[PDB]
Write a protein that binds this ligand. Structure first.
Ligand SMILES: [Zn+2]
Lengths: 50, 50, 100, 180, 218, 337
């Protein structure tokens, strides 16, 4: 659903606007990840995955 | 399997970032879930059940 | 890179409306509010003929290649069409949805 | 406007049927350049007449860096005068030429997208890799690049003659677009 | 109301844009001081009372990650701001910023260009952390900048004003050895080791055919 | 198609009586009733791998799929022209997909392809030029910068009134066009400068950095572009005020000859000096060269006492032939191994 940066409720298509365009009523999944880029480890926020 | 295919290079070892090839694997969750509701049959693996 | 087109309204003898064309509208989308019978198509649809040919990188002969394929209203009883909308899908393709 | 297109640089190569040794011709000269892991031959740099002598390990040699045609010629035998110091044959026969480059200044702003739409059936360009428009003419089989500043360069011609009659042929398509 | 930078309305979420700009100016200034400073795991066993001389089954294998995780714990942690990673056409392309030249360097540049004709091989190491490519371009740009000061150098075909005698030997006092014969003597050592391993090669070969001939008899 | 008695050519399928027959309008003889409705291996393998690679990058770039299958036709015939051998597989599909991006005229600019493979832009555009010459693409649309505006606004996290911020922009973009700012410059450069001016005159979301985070073009190269706009003609009308409804052309001054002013019967055939007049200047002695002698290039010769001085420095810097030697000595050692 909502992000951790903007902290708005959601930005979304309404379902009845979605059910007549053959689309899927969806909200994206967000994760936060940390890893070794190189010289050092960094953490990254709000990655889209699905 | 996309990581070590990149990391099997001698020059490509220092400033490489791995996050730029996450969008190619992103929609496998989406297109898996959408046909999992559309066509009512579930191909599980840890139970192998249909 | 060939589209699908909604051209329509062929004429004959000072008159556009043939017996099959009293409800096509100016846009090709059959206009909302009047009745239909057997025959009398209401969405005029044309598809190109070179659907599976290799793209020749030139601009030589693309002027007249649309074979007709409309959608006919069958049925044993004359009906009306209630409302007609058009919009776009997830990836950008034009949609046509008319409700009888 | 009766302007004159000047010519900036030549190329010219000759054969040498004598085998060359890199040890005995580079290590006792003045313009000594030989790094074998960087490059497998030697460059001479004399600045009168300001041209450059490229050699090869097999023996062949190619000169580049002169304005005039005969300017390359007089140095092409002075270059082989150094290989007359070492007891080598220096059998140069054919003074062939396969590239002469020339630039001009025509000095009026032009459109470029109109002939990219009009004369787009043969020549085209892109803005985002390079700012210039590449123009081709198959009548002498030539390539050339133009600008928006009105400067036009001509390259890729083997013969010195062939730049000339091409250069007035491209003018009527160039002055076509007066940006009305 | 000039078109460059009025602060004039709501301007939502500009703070993450703000300290990114102040950090990129900080990053480039630490790149300046790298330049200023440069100018200048067997197997283990144990002895049980029950079974003496027993070897540990866990030391037989190696983990190959505990050693990596020690240094990865001792790396600096930073929080990625997705504005900081911005990239343009000037990204991932070789070439860097050349440290501009000083007049103290020119007396070591003119005279090294006065002694030889134009020899880019040995003058590269004279400027110890400059490389072969940009010093060649320093010959090229000076043709338009100072065309007449260069034109005095090739007219000079004589030993110059005799002050290079120090710089003749300042080049020589690094690793003082007779290089015309230092390379010869250890190269002869190298082929001596190769000849001895070639002796070890064939003497291993002759005993091998001798031994398995005896197995062919039996 | 031809009737049996009157030889008519038009047949009309009557469908009212559930027969679905075939009959002409002229005489009425049926044609046919009772309708019959229907209820190298490595060559195939090397494109099946190439299918998934086009399937790969289309997912990450949000490409609509009707370009991916169209781009497969470009790669398929460019496979036949021996263009793929030697070059990088991860490179050659990126140039192949980008062609079908501009035939469709989408918002996808080239450097977005260069970003995720983390390579230089100029490498990807190099093989793009070396491809487009070889298989002879003649017709190809221009990269109109008008496309890029209305795609930038969605990720530009601006207010709800997102249609008025692009309507005034395209008025500025058509004002950008007839004036002489972009003719040899970059599409993404000038398309990022027009949205800069429209955003500031209603909001203050522009920070010279957020639009860079979208347009991926540096900060100092766009500062010139508004100073390019400011001092051309009639811009002092539009600096402070004047609602954006001017219809004028003004002067036409591209800067490429403004810098040139800062510096300061047709032609008959045999008026230019020829090239054979210079070929016959010096006699072409193949064995001799002793007619173009001089005295300083005759003096062009080593310092004889500074020879062993100089090669000691030359041998003091060189180690490439050193490891070449024992590797050349290894060529003989591996012969008996
Ligand atoms: Zn008939």
């Amino acid at each position: 659903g909502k992000k951790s940066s903007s902290s708005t409720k959601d930005y979304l298509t309404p379902p009845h606007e979605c059910r007549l365009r053959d689309m899927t009523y969806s909200a994206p999944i967000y994760v936060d990840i940390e890893y070794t880029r190189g010289r050092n480890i960094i953490m990254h926020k709000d990655v889209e995955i699905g | 399997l996309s990581i070590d295919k990149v990391l099997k290079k001698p020059n490509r070892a220092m400033e490489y970032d791995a996050l730029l090839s996450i969008n190619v694997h992103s929609n496998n969750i989406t297109s898996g879930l959408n046909r999992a509701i559309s066509t009512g049959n579930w191909s599980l693996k840890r139970f192998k059940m249909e | 890179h060939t589209q699908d087109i909604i051209g329509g309204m062929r004429v004959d003898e000072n008159g556009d409306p043939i017996w099959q064309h009293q409800s096509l509208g100016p846009d090709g989308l059959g206009e909302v509010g009047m009745k239909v019978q057997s025959g009398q198509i209401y969405i005029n649809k044309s598809v190109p003929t070179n659907s599976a040919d290799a793209p020749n990188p030139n601009n030589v002969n693309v002027q007249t290649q649309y074979r007709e394929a409309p959608v006919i209203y069958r049925g044993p009883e004359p009906s009306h069409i209630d409302q007609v909308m058009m919009s776009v899908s997830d990836n950008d393709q034009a949609l046509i949805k008319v409700l009888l | 406007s009766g302007i004159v297109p000047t010519l900036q640089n030549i190329v010219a190569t000759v054969t040498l049927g004598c085998r060359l040794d890199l040890k005995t011709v580079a290590l006792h000269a003045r313009n000594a350049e030989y790094n074998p892991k960087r490059f497998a031959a030697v460059i001479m740099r004399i600045r009168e007449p300001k041209t450059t002598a490229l050699i090869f390990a097999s023996g062949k040699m190619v000169v580049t860096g002169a304005k005039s045609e005969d300017d390359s010629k007089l140095a092409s035998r002075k270059y082989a005068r150094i290989i007359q110091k070492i007891g080598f044959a220096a059998k140069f026969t054919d003074f062939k030429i396969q590239n002469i480059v020339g630039s001009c200044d025509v000095k009026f702003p032009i459109r470029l997208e109109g002939l990219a739409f009009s004369h787009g059936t043969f020549s085209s360009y892109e803005p985002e890799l390079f700012p210039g428009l590449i123009y081709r003419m198959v009548k002498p089989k030539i390539v050339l690049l133009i600008f928006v500043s009105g400067k036009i360069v001509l390259t890729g011609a083997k013969q010195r003659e062939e730049i000339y009659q091409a250069f007035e042929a491209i003018y009527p398509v160039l002055s076509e677009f007066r940006k009305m | 109301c000039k078109p460059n930078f009025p602060i004039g309305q709501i301007s939502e979420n500009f703070e993450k844009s703000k300290m990114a700009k102040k950090a990129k100016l900080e990053k480039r200034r630490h790149l300046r001081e790298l330049r200023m400073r440069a100018r200048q795991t067997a197997i283990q066993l144990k002895l049980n009372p029950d079974g003496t001389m027993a070897i540990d089954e866990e030391t037989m294998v190696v983990d190959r990650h505990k050693n990596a995780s020690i240094e990865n714990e001792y790396k600096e942690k930073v929080d990625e701001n997705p504005f900081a990673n911005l990239y343009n056409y000037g990204s991932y392309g070789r070439g860097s910023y050349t440290d501009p030249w000083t007049v103290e360097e020119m007396i070591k540049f003119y005279k090294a260009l006065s002694m030889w004709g134009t020899d880019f091989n040995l003058i590269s190491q004279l400027y110890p952390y400059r490389s072969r490519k940009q010093v060649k371009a320093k010959f090229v740009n000076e043709e338009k900048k100072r065309p007449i000061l260069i034109e005095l150098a090739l007219r000079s075909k004589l030993p110059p004003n005799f002050d290079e005698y120090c710089c003749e030997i300042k080049k020589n006092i690094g690793t003082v050895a007779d290089f015309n014969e230092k390379l010869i003597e250890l190269q002869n050592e190298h082929k001596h080791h190769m000849k001895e391993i070639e002796e070890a090669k064939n003497t291993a070969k002759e005993e091998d055919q001798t031994a398995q001939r005896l197995n062919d008899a039996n | 198609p031809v009737c049996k008695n009157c030889h008519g050519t038009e047949f009309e399928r009557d469908l009212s009586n559930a027969n679905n027959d075939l009959v002409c309008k002229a005489c009425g003889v049926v044609s046919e009733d009772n309708p019959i409705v229907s209820e190298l291996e490595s060559r195939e393998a090397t494109l099946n791998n190439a299918r998934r690679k086009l399937r790969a990058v289309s997912y990450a770039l949000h490409i609509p799929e009707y370009i991916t299958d169209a781009a497969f036709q470009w790669y398929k015939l460019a496979l036949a022209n021996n263009f793929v051998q030697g070059r990088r597989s991860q490179n050659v599909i990126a140039s192949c997909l980008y062609v079908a991006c501009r035939k469709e005229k989408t918002h996808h600019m080239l450097i977005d392809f260069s970003s995720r493979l983390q390579v230089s832009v100029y490498s990807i555009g190099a093989t793009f030029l070396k491809m487009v010459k070889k298989l002879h693409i003649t017709e190809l649309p221009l990269a109109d910068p008008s496309l890029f505006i209305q795609h930038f606004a969605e990720k530009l996290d601006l207010a709800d009134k997102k249609i008025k911020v692009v309507k005034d922009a395209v008025k500025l973009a058509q004002r950008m066009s007839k004036d002489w700012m972009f003719e040899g410059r970059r599409p993404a450069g000038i398309a990022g400068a027009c949205i800069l001016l429209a955003c500031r005159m209603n909001n203050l979301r522009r920070t010279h950095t957020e639009i860079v985070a979208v347009s991926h073009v540096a900060e100092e190269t766009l500062q010139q572009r508004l100073n390019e706009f400011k001092n051309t003609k009639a811009a002092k009308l539009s600096v402070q005020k004047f609602r954006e409804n001017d219809v004028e052309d003004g002067e036409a001054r591209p800067p490429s000859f403004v810098k040139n002013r800062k510096k300061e019967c047709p032609r008959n055939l045999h008026l230019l000096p020829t090239t054979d007049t210079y070929l016959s200047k010096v006699s072409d002695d193949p064995d001799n060269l002793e007619d173009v002698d001089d005295e300083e290039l005759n003096a062009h010769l080593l310092n004889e006492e500074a020879s062993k001085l100089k090669e000691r420095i030359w041998i003091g810097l060189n180690a490439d032939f050193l490891l070449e030697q024992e590797s050349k000595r290894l060529k003989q050692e591996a012969d008996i191994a």
